[PDB]
Amino acid sequence: PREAAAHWVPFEDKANMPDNVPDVVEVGATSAPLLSASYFIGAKCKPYNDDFMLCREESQGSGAIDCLKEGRRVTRCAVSVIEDINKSCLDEFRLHWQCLEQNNHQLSGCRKAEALLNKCVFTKLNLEKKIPGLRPDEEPVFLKKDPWIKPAVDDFKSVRAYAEAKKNGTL
């Protein structure tokens, strides 16, 4: 919760998870894939993560030491989601963060690559991006048409993929 030093030195410890906690399948996803699939792991693993922050709340002082069962719980289901999308829409999902690896991860960059993915995951993995807190008669901003902030350079692959989504009638 604090920025680093004048001259901080990094350090690590070659030790292990000692006795009781079994090993987990720890998320080996870099920022751009998990940022892309953030809505879907928030959609499927909603009450699990909600339980996580609830249990971290009620464990005042215990905190970190209490909910190890739950840190085991909430990561694994997200790993299940990303493995299912590794099997599901790996071309288009990868393409979404092939676009999103530029633009400083600004989500404003890759609308045309995004809407191709929204049909795909809702087809096979049958999940959906939903923005909570958005009261009705208010357009969700990745659903709207003619945005004000149009991005800098759309990638060359997903624009052709978008045209082919129109020609195949998948859109």
Partner 1 sequence: AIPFEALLPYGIIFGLLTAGGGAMQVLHVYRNGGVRDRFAIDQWDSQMMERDLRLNGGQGRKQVDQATAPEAFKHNHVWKSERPLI
Partner 2 sequence: MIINIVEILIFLVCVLFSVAYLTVAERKTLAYMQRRLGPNFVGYYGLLQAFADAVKLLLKEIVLPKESNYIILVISPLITLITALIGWVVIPLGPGITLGELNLGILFSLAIGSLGVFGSLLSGWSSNSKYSLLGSIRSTAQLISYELILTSIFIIIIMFVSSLNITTIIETQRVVWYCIPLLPLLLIFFIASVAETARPPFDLTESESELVAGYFTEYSGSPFVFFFLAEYSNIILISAFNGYLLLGGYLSFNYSYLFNILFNDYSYVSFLFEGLINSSAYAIKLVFLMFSFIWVRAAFPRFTYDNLINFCWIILLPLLFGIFLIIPSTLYIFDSFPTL
Partner 3 sequence: LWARIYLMPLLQAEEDRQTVRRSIAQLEREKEIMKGTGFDVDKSVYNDGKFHAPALMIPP
Footprint on this chain of partner 3 (rule: CB under 8 A): 9, 11, 13, 15-18, 21, 24, 26-27, 34-35, 38-39, 41-42, 49, 52-53, 56, 61-65, 67-68, 70-72, 74-75, 78, 107, 131-133
> Which DSSP symbol is given to 94?
H
Report which residue type is found at 129.
Answer: K
Identify the CA nearest to 95 among candidates 169, 161, 10.
Answer: 161
Nearer Cβ to partner 1, position 143 or 159? 159
Binding of partner 2 at residue 8 (CB under 8 A)?
Answer: no
Nearer Cβ to partner 2, position 42 or 151? 151
Residue 163: other Cβ atoms inside 10 A: 12
Q: Is 135 left (phi over 0), alpha (psi -120 to 50) or beta?
A: beta
Binding of partner 2 at residue 149 (CB under 8 A)?
Answer: yes
Of the candidate residues 21, 131, 159, 171, the single one contacting partner 2 (CB under 8 A): 159
Q: How far apart are CA 105 and CA 137, in angstroms?
A: 28
Of the candidate residues 46, 54, 64, 86, the single one contacting partner 1 (CB under 8 A): 86
Residues in contact with 171: Cβ distance below 8 Å, sequence separation at least 6, in sequence order: 115, 116, 119, 162, 165
Which parts of this chain interact with partner 1 (CB under 8 A)? 3-12, 14, 16-17, 25-33, 79, 82-83, 86, 94, 97, 101-105
